[PDB]
Design a binder for this molecule. Sequence first.
Ligand SMILES: [Mg+2]
Ligand SMILES: [Mg+2]
Ligand SMILES: [Mg+2]
Ligand SMILES: [Mg+2]
Length: 257
Amino acid sequence: ISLAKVGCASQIGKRKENEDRFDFAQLTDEVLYFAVYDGHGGPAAADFCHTHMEKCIMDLLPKEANLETLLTLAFLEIDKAFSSHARLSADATLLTSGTTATVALLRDGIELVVASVGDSRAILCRKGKPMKLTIDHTPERADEKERIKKCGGFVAWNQPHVNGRLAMTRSIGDLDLKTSGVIAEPETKRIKLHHADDSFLVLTTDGINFMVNSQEICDFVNQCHDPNEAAHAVTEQAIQYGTEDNSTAVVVPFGAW
Ligand SMILES: [Mg+2]
Ligand SMILES: [Mg+2]
Ligand SMILES: [Mg+2]
Ligand SMILES: [Mg+2]
């Protein structure tokens, strides 16, 4: 696998700051890492994950062979770390700072494991068909709604927001909403890559998702030259369809192994 080929674009939209972060790296000989972080309420939480996620993972790699279990621990461990960082700084806004997290680990070139909290997305495109690797955590999910109430929170409306503040039901940070049911525990998925067909991993933030569905994302990946152009193509298409949030796409090509 080559990382010179990974394509990524991030556009700011009609917002004052761009709070999307993304990273990818070769962690060990066997483990590749890919991530998007959609921040809100200040970039502090997205930056924190961007800065520290790779060490939470690497320190746990020698201890945990189930990568779904590994990322669960890493997410909860990094959220506990952000809590303390926030509670101990002079800036009180860090207590309202949050972020989505969608992280992918590829082991041995073959085993793809994806964990996320929030409404940023991961899909896999093989032969121009998408497969969803994530499901959005939003209050319009019956199971998510029930946890929010069980924990004593509520959902308000313009379109549904937890306690009138948070458009999603899981996240890293948002220290005050943690008691009301906003958790840092991811949902996970494990798959094996195709031995013969080329498959692409695409991470996107909600600015893109609002206007470009999963199928149209495969079309851009399928029809553009390199992943670089495809990533820039799909973020720009979202802006032109009417999206105003920050928009970030990351396109990862996998060889047939
Ligand atoms: Mg890094
Ligand atoms: Mg954002
Ligand atoms: Mg949102
Ligand atoms: Mg967003």
